Structure formats: structure tokens, C-alpha cells
Write an enzyme that holds these catalytic residues in place. Structure first.
Site, PDB file in Angstrom:
ATOM      1  CE  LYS A  85       0.038   2.384   8.362  1.00 47.88           C
ATOM      2  NZ  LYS A  85      -1.238   3.381   8.887  1.00 47.88           N
ATOM      3  CB  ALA A 122      -0.177  11.870   0.663  1.00 50.11           C
ATOM      4  CB  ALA A 135       1.828   5.562   5.623  1.00 50.30           C
ATOM      5  N   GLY A 149       0.778  -1.184  -0.040  1.00 47.56           N
ATOM      6  CA  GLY A 149      -0.072   0.005   0.205  1.00 47.56           C
ATOM      7  C   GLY A 149       0.822   1.217  -0.200  1.00 47.56           C
ATOM      8  CG  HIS A 150       1.618   4.782  -2.783  1.00 49.70           C
ATOM      9  ND1 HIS A 150       0.544   4.532  -3.674  1.00 49.70           N
ATOM     10  CD2 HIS A 150       1.747   5.973  -2.910  1.00 49.70           C
ATOM     11  CE1 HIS A 150       0.524   5.458  -4.424  1.00 49.70           C
ATOM     12  NE2 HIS A 150       1.205   6.442  -3.960  1.00 49.70           N
ATOM     13  CG  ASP A 195      -9.163   9.035   7.236  1.00 48.32           C
ATOM     14  OD1 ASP A 195      -9.821   9.608   6.516  1.00 48.32           O
ATOM     15  OD2 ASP A 195      -7.921   8.672   6.889  1.00 48.32           O
TER      16      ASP A 195
END
Ligand SMILES: CN1C(=O)c2ccccc2N(C)c2nc(Nc3cnn(C4CCNCC4)c3)ncc21
Ligand SMILES: [Mg+2]
Ligand SMILES: [Mg+2]
Ligand code: NA
Length: 269
Positions: free
Chosen positions: A39, A19, A21, A16-17, A131
Site C-alpha cells: 500500500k 482517494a 491509498a 486497488g485504489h 470505517d
């Protein structure tokens, strides 16, 4: 191969990417069969990335629950930060919903019972997430819906909020933000209940309850509709209709509260 404590990973194994992490699949250095996710900072946004990973450590080291992503270890230094976290082998709810289009009410109930369990702990600890969205709901298969275990993830925006206080930081994803958040007002723990309602609605229908062309459009829409009622398909069960109507209430003071959520009839059935 990089090591963090008793764990290791390769940057070839990107899972995963965003902005703030980057996440790699890894393993225990001694027991190679024990999978983890590491992470790391995203160097393209170094300072903010470092801040958010540090906040996630601060919060998650206090939260242990089967429906919250586990933090096995971490390493903070002046110029680097790593979290060693639970690897969820089913990916995210977003991808699952894209594949399934919509979920059955029974599947929604199973997932929401689990989200509710996690939220009971956040609420008892005085933590708000801020979030919640399908990308931050992870799934693990111990591959039919009865066996799926859901984990709330990405606590970089989470904070303690004292029960007589209000938050005001603008953060979250606009399509999942409570009206009070996107309208730059004070908010509390009930903002996350709006987000949950939005996720539930999206699972049921495959769409957002309140569609807009942009964040600005969505905000203006909330501003001008003081009475706001979600479109709920007629075929929806009576308890799920009641849950969605009570969660997706524009004015936070009127919205479903945590006790009503945890004990809602939809979650028995
Ligand atoms: C720790 N952590 C996170 O903080 C997180 C939080 C929010 C969003 C993503 C995260 N990332 C990438 C995380 N992702 C996974 N699991 C994951 C991802 N993608 N997949 C797929 C599916 C099967 N087939 C290939 C691989 C499996 N677990 C833990 C994660
Ligand atoms: Mg967060
Ligand atoms: Mg609020
Ligand atoms: Na919404």
C-alpha cells in the site's frame, strides 16, 4: 520494479485504489512465491494519504490476529510511506455479495464469528476502527464458504479511545455510520457494532436496513425517528433476528455491548 525492504512490486499490478491509498500486488524478493500487497500514497491527496497510511502503521503494528490484515513491514520517510501487507486472494466482501446477491445464515455466522474474534482484540486493546463496511472486509481462500477466512482491513481511521472517553471525529462511510456518528455527536466503540449490524443485514437481505437518497437524507431520517426498528424478513431465524434488533439500535447507550455480541446465541449455532 520497486523494492521496500525484502519485498518488491510493480505498479503494473494495481489491485486497488481509493482517494487515500493505492495497493499493488508484490512478493518477497527472495521467495517469489510469497505474495504480499504493498500500500502506497495516492499522490492526488498526498497530505491526507500520508497521514492515513501513517496511522494505519501505528495501529496495525500493535494488532496481530488471523482475522485482521497482517502488516509484514513498512517504510516511513519524510516524503513517502509504504506498507507491506497481507495479500487476501478472495478480494472484498462487497464484490462477493454482489456476485452472490445474498448469503445464507450459515455463511453469515461463519463470517461473523471471525469478525467477532477480530473485534474482541480491538476492544481489549482499546481501539475503534471507524470505517467498517464490506469494501474493508477482505476474504482469503486457503472455494466454498466453510473455508473462507475473513480479514478486517483499512485501519487508517482507527484510533485508541480510552474507556472513559468519547470520540467525535466525523469519519467513516455514511451508509455504515452509527446514528450518533452521522448526527455529529460523541460516540464510542459501540459505533462499530452498528456498522457490523449493517453489514450483517446487507449480507442477509442484499440491501441497507435504512435506505436514503443521500447522506443528508439518512441523517435527517435518523434525527426524526427516535424509535427506529429495522425491517427484518419474517423467515429470518429467531437468534439472527435478535442479533440484528440489538445491534441496530439508534441510541448507543441502549445498543448491544461487546460482551453480549461476543457471546450472542447466533454465533454458537
Ligand atoms: C492490503 N490490502 C488493503 O489494505 C485493502 C484494504 C481495503 C480494501 C482493499 C485493500 N486492497 C486492495 C487489498 N486487496 C487485497 N486483495 C485483493 C484485492 N483484489 N483482489 C482480486 C481478487 C482475486 N482476483 C484478482 C485480484 C485481491 N488484499 C489486501 C489488500
Ligand atoms: Mg479505519
Ligand atoms: Mg457510540
Ligand atoms: Na446503516
Amino acid at each position: 520494479t520497486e523494492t521496500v525492504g525484502k519485498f518488491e512490486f510493480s505498479r503494473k499490478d494495481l489491485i486497488g485504489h481509493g482517494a487515500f491509498a493505492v495497493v499493488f500486488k508484490g512478493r518477497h524478493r527472495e521467495k517469489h512465491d510469497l505474495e504480499v500487497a504493498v500500500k502506497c500514497i495516492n499522490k492526488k491527496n498526498l497530505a491526507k494519504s500520508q497521514t492515513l497510511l501513517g496511522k494505519e502503521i501505528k495501529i496495525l503494528k500493535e494488532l496481530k490476529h488471523e482475522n485482521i490484515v497482517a502488516l509484514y513491514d513498512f517504510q516511513e520517510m519524510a516524503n513517502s510511506v509504504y506498507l507491506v501487507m497481507e495479500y487476501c486472494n478472495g478480494g472484498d466482501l462487497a464484490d462477493y455479495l454482489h456476485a452472490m446477491r445474498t448469503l445464507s445464515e450459515d455463511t453469515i455466522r461463519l463470517f461473523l464469528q471471525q469478525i467477532a474474534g477480530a473485534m474482541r482484540l480491538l476492544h481489549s486493546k482499546g481501539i475503534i476502527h471507524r470505517d467498517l463496511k464490506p469494501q474493508n472486509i477482505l476474504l482469503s481462500n486457503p472455494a466454498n464458504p466453510n473455508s473462507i477466512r475473513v480479514k478486517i482491513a483499512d485501519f487508517g481511521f482507527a484510533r485508541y479511545l480510552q474507556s472513559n472517553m468519547m470520540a467525535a471525529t466525523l469519519c467513516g462511510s455514511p451508509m455504515y455510520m452509527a446514528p450518533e456518528v452521522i448526527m455529529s455527536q460523541h460516540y464510542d466503540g459501540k459505533a462499530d457494532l452498528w456498522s457490523i449490524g449493517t453489514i450483517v443485514y446487507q449480507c442477509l437481505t442484499g440491501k441497507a436496513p435504512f435506505q436514503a437518497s443521500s447522506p443528508q437524507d439518512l441523517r435527517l431520517f435518523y434525527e426524526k425517528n427516535k424509535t427506529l426498528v429495522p425491517t427484518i424478513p419474517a423467515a429470518t431465524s429467531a437468534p439472527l433476528r435478535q442479533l440484528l434488533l440489538a445491534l441496530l439500535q439508534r441510541n448507543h447507550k441502549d445498543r448491544m455491548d461487546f460482551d453480549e455480541f461476543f457471546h450472542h446465541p447466533f454465533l454458537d449455532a
